[PDB]
Design an enzyme around this catalytic site. Structure first.
Site, PDB file in Angstrom:
ATOM      1  N   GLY D  31       0.774  -1.230   0.000  1.00  0.00           N
ATOM      2  CA  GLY D  31       0.000   0.000   0.000  1.00  0.00           C
ATOM      3  C   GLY D  31       0.804   1.278   0.000  1.00  0.00           C
ATOM      4  CB  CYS D 240     -27.133  -7.949 -17.117  1.00  0.00           C
ATOM      5  SG  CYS D 240     -26.442  -7.883 -18.821  1.00  0.00           S
ATOM      6  CB  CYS D 243     -26.092 -12.183 -19.236  1.00  0.00           C
ATOM      7  SG  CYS D 243     -25.598 -11.329 -17.713  1.00  0.00           S
ATOM      8  CB  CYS D 265     -22.419  -7.274 -17.688  1.00  0.00           C
ATOM      9  SG  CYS D 265     -23.356  -8.479 -16.759  1.00  0.00           S
ATOM     10  CB  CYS D 271     -21.912  -9.763 -20.150  1.00  0.00           C
ATOM     11  SG  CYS D 271     -23.664  -9.422 -20.525  1.00  0.00           S
TER      12      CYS D 271
HETATM   13 ZN   LIG Z   1     -24.673  -9.352 -18.580  1.00  0.00          ZN
END
Ligand SMILES: [Zn+2]
Ligand SMILES: [Zn+2]
Ligand SMILES: [Zn+2]
Ligand SMILES: [Zn+2]
EC number: 4.7.1.1
Lengths: 149, 193, 353, 277, 353, 144, 277, 194
Positions: D31, D240, D243, D265, D271
């Protein structure tokens, strides 16, 4: 160091030469000389150092293009060049001449017929330019004799 | 006559780096750096491969006197152009064997709070990566626990278990043996089993 | 129902083709040569070399042709090219006392040794568009005077010999190189000067201008500006002696700034320094003015303007960084915007008056 | 393979070496923003040069490279970056997350979980999580040295007070390995939970700002929050539209001059694989 | 003794001849035509029209030729020319919804009505110097798609119709004109925008950049950038009805900025606006970002960065002012310097070291 | 005859948008013959551009463009005008001449058919051709 | 007498008219900086455009114009300005202060006293005498409105404390008609006394900063001081090397590489007068 | 008459008039003559008309008092200067009256502000005589020692001048006209009776 100075001089004259003129001059001399390329012309950068206030501490002021080459003559003589710009054939030619100038059979001849003429040309160009620039000088005062009271 | 380096410097440095990256980011995992086939004796294959991969003119290298000879020195200079320093406190990469002293270890640069990267990496050649005191590693890079048993000198084990320097300060450790390598960064919690 | 299709590469290729066609323009006109740009648009070339960082007029002009004259894009093209080149040498430090002069002026005395040499300049022109340039024309046949370059000491040498200014001395300190190591404020003066040379002309001019109007005042006079050719030399390891590789046309600006009264010594002027490739001098002047502003730490001065604020000045100076990040807003940002929308819609629903 | 006349992966070996050293420091100091001497690339600063320099320093001839921007492989700048690497490495590429060995990304972590020996490389504009509180690096570097991170808690509660909610929605700060506060790059806060105890290595490159940082595999990554205001992620009323997934980060695609839109997506690989069954 | 002689006029004449000679360069090369510059260096011309203030591509290209490619000198040449021209009309306000598009993008959604139209752009190019440009070449044969322009509503109209942003409404207020009245701060937004359009690209880019890095942040997104042709109309007194006099190629940028939550009404995004001549975008983007920064007074924002400081930004923006005053240091200043010397010498004399 | 305002606006717009070389070529092929005087010689100055904040809002000034105006008078007293962007003085005078001629019954239908409509068609075809080129750079995302 | 194609004196009539109105306001409010809508000229801003616009708005066919810069008629920019006016008005010009009706100057008041119906027009860079104390015009405008000039006294005191003397050597502030504090332009201190109760009209033009101001004939003009520390002027240990005058402001001319110098009259017309007599 | 004629030589006659008015304003009490204009636009006199032709345009609203207001004057001012003609004195940059000016009208004239003292009115007052009135002594800027003048002035105008109710830098500047002749008194001038 006069021998060093002499070489520094012919290298400088070559580096400042116009590639076309050097090629033309060299061809007209018709020198047959066998050589090996030790370092093929390579174009990169030279990093520029400047100084604060012209005279003080160093600082980096960008880069310029630089081309380097190296050759070897049959007798072992090594010729070198480092020339501003990107002209690889020109750098190779400058390296070759640096080598030839180190040889007894060529030094005096090339000094008279190649290096001195190239230098003269450059010096004439410099003088001609200064004559043009000087027309732009601002006149203020001139010295004379005589006057009243 | 100098030692030879990578036969495929571009590809071999990349491969060595990815193995070391694996080791440092998943502490205790042993990796092999196979691409170099002769180490620069007394430097083993892994040590030499790390230096060829990471060392250059920007990285002072200190080689402890047991690992210090003119052929290795000249070969390092020729192939990497790294400055060789004779003081551990000056090194970016320190290279020692098991004979490392407490004074040398403690002289190594650790970074600062504001610049923790500015310290040394210690490359330590060990007699074996097994058969030493059994350790448990935990921390970043370790899902749960990892056990390792490298042959370690006590003062190195002390550095690891006690962490005298407050994070983010500290050296990162690379243990090498033959072609093989194990890394323990400053983050790893280490305890003796 | 919708199905995803590919389109990115096809669109980009067409986009670049459109740009290339626009760059060529009307093919009833001849295509511009890089040589013409180099010779005749030589002040554009000066800027591109200085900020791009490579003093090669053909490459800078090539970059300008490629960029359709866009200086910022040309600067970036040349800067990007720099990354691909090997560093073959480092020059001996330039010696501006050896300059073969094109131009040399000083604002601080009416006349000086070597004179006021105006050189090629747009100074004192009446800015009236010249419509004769819309046709082929003939350049002036130049008058000539004596060919001698007179001795032209630096004005700051004259001042220093009088004890009115201090010579810039060399302690032998190794310069910092911002192209190798990222900036860490506060920076040495060698680092600040390197950064200023590469910085955007317009931004640095504006900052310098703000100091002239009282935002970090430093009472500037143009002590000297000189433009001309300087020999460049290297000392190659193969030979061990200096080799003159060529020359650079450069412009050097030395500004006189407000005097100070140090405890142990007589009061004296302070100073600023600018140095650029070619003839375009306004960048050198801005460089010198902002150089002096950023000497505030050495003089224990407190900032009364942005130009004295080292991180603010230098963090926002290189247009390769600046123009890149402003222009990057053109990239798709719809994931991040959708995150903002998702919240904003929620905040709206929670209010319904 | 590489038939371009450039060095493999464009960078010279010195630049790769310096970057490799920086990556190894970043890994050992999770970090922490490691400064590096980054160089100008054929892409403008701001258009992913940090990620490009990391990928170029990491990638080898046998890697399989995936490049995404906004979660999609076909995004203009992803196409540009992927094609650049194809030109200068000849590396095999893929759109499938689970086939990649190196993933270079701008603003998304894939929906598909990453696995051992995968490396994901984030493009970062602002590497300093404190920067919009304190614009000076001279100040923020000391705050990190001293672990002075209270101002970020303040900023958060001030959002809560003003709007009723935390207003940081992407580039949402995280605490790494219980110490450094890190900017995760401009991924949506939705992706932050994927960073915690991940089997893959995460590298972060900010080219313009000259920083590299890292999260080793299996490292704690905890988003900043409060007990009375726990971490939340983006949500949508719609699945979505292609999908049907309700588990993915969605893009809002505007269809009509007036009103109609579609949510699909962001992660286009995910997707298509959803759609296939 | 010394006597004074005349020298000023003959030096200046020689200096200008030298500059003209340098501008023409090697006469073995053809002289560049203004038409070539206009066509092939078209992005330089865009900048010069915008800051020079006259949307005439030939005049801007002429100024560039005359200035040896120096953008700042070219801008000043074009701006000075402005003064010599009669104002013959004032246009009806431009309608950018009537633009025939060369390019239209939006960063805030993946796809939008009318689509992402990349147009001619250097975006997504790999910046590798193209040495084929050193010889004559052939421009690409452009591929074609369907010839209709799709409906392309402004993205901010989409946002405003959802209530996520507010429409910019016309109250009928007469715009201020800084070409007629000198600026006196604070200025109306109409005055600020006029000044920003005229302002130096590099300076405004650096200020915009600084806001992106946290010096007066405004959380920008590129809502829309569109480039294309807009019809220009006037209403001549002779006729009393509108006449269409031609078209301008222009680029419009609308930035989405941080949302606010006003009392009573739903929270909503704020915004910025940029508008320039030609295709070159980065100025339009910088203009929009600094526009939003300078909306601080309307939003009761405390200025934390210089970009939010109205007088500091606008007083130092116009390079016709900036470059003129920085460069004026080259004028003789020996009377003033002598006054400084006279004092400094006295101060030295009054000390003993 | 007395052309309505929109009809006049249309032919003036077509002329103002015409390429000066194409207008010159076309007008010469028709034979001018009509007598006229120039009552305002072509004069080039500026038109000040007004824009709007956010496209739709308050006006602000966005620089200037070059504008050339001219005026002619025919034998019967008919006045023709032009205001054209740019600096082409001959072009402006030609545009003004045609504006006068178009107001006469003798010429209106003939010039509408043989000059104005062809000019307009050529410009529309140039616009279409360019839009076809530009549309190749559209980014496709989804189908059907 | 203009044969350029341009309007007489270049400016159009509306611009002259607007400047004429500003001049008359300036005369009625002595020392007050009147804003004006100045226009770009063929000389860059900073190079005398305010003086040019004033001269163009007052000058007539029968005026005799003198233009000086640093006291000299032959100075580059004076030549440029004078030749410009010759081109666009055709007026008679002179180098003799005595014969001029209008004198345009940068940084000198002539040694020759001015007389009734002469107008002297000063080129001014910074019209605001408070500017190097307070850089904001938003503040200095109000300081003038309220006659709040006390801070200038602190500045003078501080000079004296630090150096033992007032450090302002040119553009030395003056109080006009017992009220406004005015910048006299960058004339040396030496010239300030000439401004007091002068028979000629004084106009001041700052083109870039867009201000015009004025001092009517026979108006009090008094340099700022203390009751304790009195106003003094520049001195030299030498006479003019050309004319022998000891009463003129001198130029230092550096003659050679060594330390050799010459001091000569700044006012080159005065010098001519003295020497030919 | 519909339309009056303006200057025969608009450039030169305006320059002439301006330089005369400049002399008058910068040296208060000096009486100057303006006719590069053959006749005033009645009832405006030569001097008044010349001043308006020289200084007024679309940027300077003009108010004319009722006795000086008629169609021919108004149309001629509009045509030649394009100045806006306003109906209230407080709206004016240039106010034009005769001796019948009321205290109400005088007090309504803009005086400028302390920060923008130039942003007020100039009063052009047509008087029947520049010499038949009360003798005044003038001192101040523009006057070496003292200058006597004796214009015919309304009481309220003399009051403004002697008492200066508005603190400097506020105040109207006064231009007195009579035939071709003009006298100016700026706000700086100290004015006393006798
Ligand atoms: Zn999708
Ligand atoms: Zn971004
Ligand atoms: Zn100055
Ligand atoms: Zn003298």
């Amino acid at each position: 160091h006069a021998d060093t100075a002499t070489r520094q001089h012919w290298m400088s004259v070559l580096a400042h030469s116009q590639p076309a003129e050097l090629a033309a001059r060299l061809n007209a001399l018709n020198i047959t000389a066998d050589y090996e390329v030790i370092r093929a012309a390579e174009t990169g950068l030279v990093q520029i150092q400047a100084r604060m206030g012209g005279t003080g501490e160093r600082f980096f002021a960008g880069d310029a293009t630089l081309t380097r080459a190296a050759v070897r003559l049959t007798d072992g003589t090594l010729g070198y060049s480092w020339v501003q710009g990107r002209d690889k054939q020109h750098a190779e030619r400058c390296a070759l001449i640096d080598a030839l100038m180190q040889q007894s059979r060529h030094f005096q001849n090339l000094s008279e017929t190649l290096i001195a003429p190239l230098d003269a040309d450059r010096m004439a160009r410099i003088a001609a330019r200064q004559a043009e620039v000087n027309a732009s000088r601002v006149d203020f005062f001139t010295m004379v004799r005589g006057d009243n009271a | 006559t100098l030692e030879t380096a990578f036969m495929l410097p571009v590809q071999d440095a990349q491969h060595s780096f990815r193995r070391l990256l694996k080791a440092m980011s998943e502490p205790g995992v042993i990796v092999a750096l196979h691409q170099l086939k002769r180490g620069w004796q007394p430097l083993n294959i892994a040590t030499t491969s790390v230096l060829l991969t990471l060392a250059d003119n920007d990285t002072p290298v200190w080689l402890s006197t047991p690992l210090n000879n003119d052929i290795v020195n000249q070969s390092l200079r020729f192939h990497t152009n790294a400055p060789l320093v004779s003081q551990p406190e000056q090194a970016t990469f320190a290279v020692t064997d098991e004979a490392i002293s407490s004074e040398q270890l403690n002289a190594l640069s650790t970074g600062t709070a504001v610049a923790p990267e500015a310290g040394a990496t210690l490359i330590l050649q060990v007699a074996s990566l097994s058969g030493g005191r059994m350790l448990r590693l935990t921390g970043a890079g370790i899902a749960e626990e990892r056990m390792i048993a490298p042959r370690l000198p006590e003062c190195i084990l002390h550095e690891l278990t006690e962490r005298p320097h407050p994070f983010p300060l500290g050296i990162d450790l690379i243990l090498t043996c033959g072609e093989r390598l194990l890394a323990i960064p400053r983050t790893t919690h280490v305890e003796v089993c | 129902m919708y199905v995803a299709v590919k389109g990115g590469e096809k669109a980009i290729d067409a986009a670049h083709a459109l740009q290339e066609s626009r760059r060529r323009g009307d093919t009833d006109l001849p295509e511009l040569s890089v040589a013409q740009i180099e010779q005749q648009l030589n002040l554009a070339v000066d800027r591109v070399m200085t900020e791009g960082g490579i003093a090669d007029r053909e490459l800078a002009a090539l970059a300008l042709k490629q960029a359709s004259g866009d200086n910022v894009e040309a600067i970036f093209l040349l800067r990007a090219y720099r990354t691909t080149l090997a560093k073959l040498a480092v020059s001996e430090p330039l010696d501006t006392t050896g300059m073969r002069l094109e131009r040399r002026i000083s604002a601080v005395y009416k006349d000086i040794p070597g004179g006021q040499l105006l050189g090629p300049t747009y100074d004192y022109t009446h800015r009236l568009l010249d419509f004769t340039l819309l046709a082929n024309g003939e350049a002036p046949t130049l008058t000539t005077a004596d060919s001698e370059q007179q001795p032209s000491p630096h004005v700051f040498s004259l001042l220093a010999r009088q004890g009115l200014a201090k010579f810039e001395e060399d302690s032998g300190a190794q310069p910092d190189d911002i192209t190798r190591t990222p900036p860490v404020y506060p920076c040495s003066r060698s680092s600040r000067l390197q950064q200023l040379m590469r910085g955007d002309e317009g931004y640095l001019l504006a900052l310098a201008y703000s100091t002239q109007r009282g935002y970090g005042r430093n009472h500037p006079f143009a002590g000297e500006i000189r433009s001309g050719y300087i020999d460049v030399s290297i000392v190659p390891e193969e030979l061990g002696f200096a080799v003159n590789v060529g020359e650079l046309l450069m412009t050097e600006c030395e500004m006189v700034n407000g005097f100070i009264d140090p405890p142990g010594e007589p009061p004296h002027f302070t100073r600023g320094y600018g140095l650029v490739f070619g003839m375009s001098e306004r960048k050198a002047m801005a460089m010198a003015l902002v150089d002096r502003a950023l000497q505030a730490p050495e003089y224990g001065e407190h900032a009364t303007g942005p130009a004295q604020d080292e991180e603010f000045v230098l963090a926002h100076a290189d247009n390769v960084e600046v123009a890149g990040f402003v222009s990057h807003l053109k990239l798709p940002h719809y994931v991040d915007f959708q995150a903002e929308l998702e919240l904003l819609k929620r905040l709206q629903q929670e209010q319904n008056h | 393979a590489n038939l371009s006349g450039y060095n493999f992966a464009y960078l010279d070996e010195q630049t790769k070496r310096m970057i490799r050293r920086a990556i190894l420091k970043a890994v050992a100091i999770p970090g922490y923003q490691v400064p590096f001497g980054g160089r100008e690339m054929p892409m403008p600063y701001g258009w992913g040069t940090g990620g490009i320099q990391l990928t170029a320093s990491v990638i080898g001839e046998s890697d399989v490279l995936k490049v995404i921007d906004q979660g999609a492989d076909d995004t203009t700048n992803a196409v540009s970056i992927r094609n650049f690497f194809k030109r200068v490495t000849g590396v095999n590429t893929t759109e499938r997350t689970d086939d990649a060995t190196v993933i270079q990304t701008r603003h998304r972590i894939p929906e598909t979980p990453l696995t051992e020996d995968q490396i994901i490389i984030f493009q970062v504009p602002i590497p300093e999580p404190l920067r919009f509180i304190e614009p000076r690096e001279t100040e923020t570097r000391t705050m990190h040295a001293l672990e002075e991170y209270g101002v970020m808690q303040v900023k958060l509660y001030e959002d809560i007070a003003r709007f009723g909610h935390i207003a940081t929605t992407y580039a949402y700060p995280v605490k790494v390995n219980g110490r450094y506060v890190m900017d995760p790059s401009p991924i949506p806060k939705f992706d932050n939970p994927k960073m915690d105890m991940m089997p893959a290595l995460q590298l972060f490159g900010a080219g313009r700002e000259k920083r590299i940082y890292a999260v080793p595999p299996f490292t704690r990554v905890e988003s900043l929050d409060f007990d009375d205001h726990p971490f939340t992620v983006q949500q949508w009323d719609e699945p979505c539209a292609i999908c049907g997934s309700t588990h993915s980060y969605l893009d809002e695609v505007v269809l009509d001059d007036a009103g109609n839109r579609m949510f699909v997506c962001s992660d286009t690989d995910y997707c298509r694989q959803q759609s296939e069954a």
